[model samples]
Target: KETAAAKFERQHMDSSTSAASSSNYCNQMMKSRNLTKDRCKPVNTFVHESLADVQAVCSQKNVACKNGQTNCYQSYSTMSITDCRETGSSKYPNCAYKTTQANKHIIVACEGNPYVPVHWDASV
Candidate 1:
């Protein structure tokens, strides 16, 4: 079964690679991750940390989600992350992205047994 939790991992997890270098990072990653198949994803991000660390955010206290989901949680520790957003000239089937790398406390929506990250709300 493909849960949103599973989808989140496939879409956002990039713990092993140092994605900060190369302007090609986002353009390459967004495609390989299947976010640019049908059309350019308006925006997306990848976490450069272990899945366990990201999932642990689910155990924290609840918070308001950007999408009106009440299950969102914020991580207590800062994490390494790379944000990929569509550029002004981005076109479909050839998605273009501008990447920004930062370390911050991330917010995520979680659910299910053992509780895990199902959505990436934002980071601060």
Candidate 2:
């Protein structure tokens, strides 16, 4: 079984990529991370920071999740991130994405025994 921390790391952590130089980053990563196994995720963000720093978001200002969960928290500082957006022409089994790198404060849902990030809710 996959733990919440493992799932979060698989979906959002990308310390190797500090910047996106081409549009293929998302297309490649989404599939490589197994996020595109069933269907392509429309929008996702990869954090290019240390795991400890990312985990610290749980202690940042509390916020309401898009789905209205109170377990969400927004990062106190802007961090390096790559935004992956599915291309308009994308089709199943042939997912395509446009990658954009930016510095933004990320919002994530925290859970589990240690209370770490479980979902990448938003970035602002």
Candidate 3:
């Protein structure tokens, strides 16, 4: 995961172009690149082999299906809708996952931050 500074650098071609670009350029590039990257990046990533493991974790201790069911990157948020074929069905699916290392990194950094919460759906 990149920080604000690193993101700015990437957008301005800093690694190869400029080590000391103007602050204004950095700011504009950061803002523009961030929006583009979020859209293109996969909302949620899952390996085919990990579905069983992910389901097992969800069954044992599920993440609340709230907050519009955001994707792993927190880019796309979705709400569940009724199934056309099944009447009165109340099943909502979709969750995000990260490697244990990534999860731990977020938890340690964001716990008690008021805006972030820890939710792990799978591990290996």
- Per TM-score, the best of the predicted structures is 1
In angstroms, the error of model 3 at 104 is 5.0
Across residues 1-124, which tens digit of lDDT does each residue of candidate 2 receive? 9987898999899988677777788998999999889899988889999999999999999999999989999999999999998889888789989889999999999998798999989999
State the local distance difference test value for candidate 2. 0.91
In candidate 2, residue 17 scores what lDDT?
A: 66
- Per-residue lDDT of model 3, residues 1-124, tens digit only: 8653233223322223212233233223333445323332222111222222222222232232334353222212221111111113212221111211112110001122232223422222
RMSD of each: 1.4, 1.3, 19.0
State the number of backbone clashes in model 1. 0
Better of 2 and 3 by lDDT: 2
What count of clashes does model 3 give? Answer: 0
TM-score of each: 0.93, 0.91, 0.20
Clashes of each: 0, 0, 0
- Residue pairs of candidate 1 with colliding backbone atoms: none
Model 1, residue 62: what's the lDDT?
82
Worst 10 residues of 1 by lDDT: 15-24
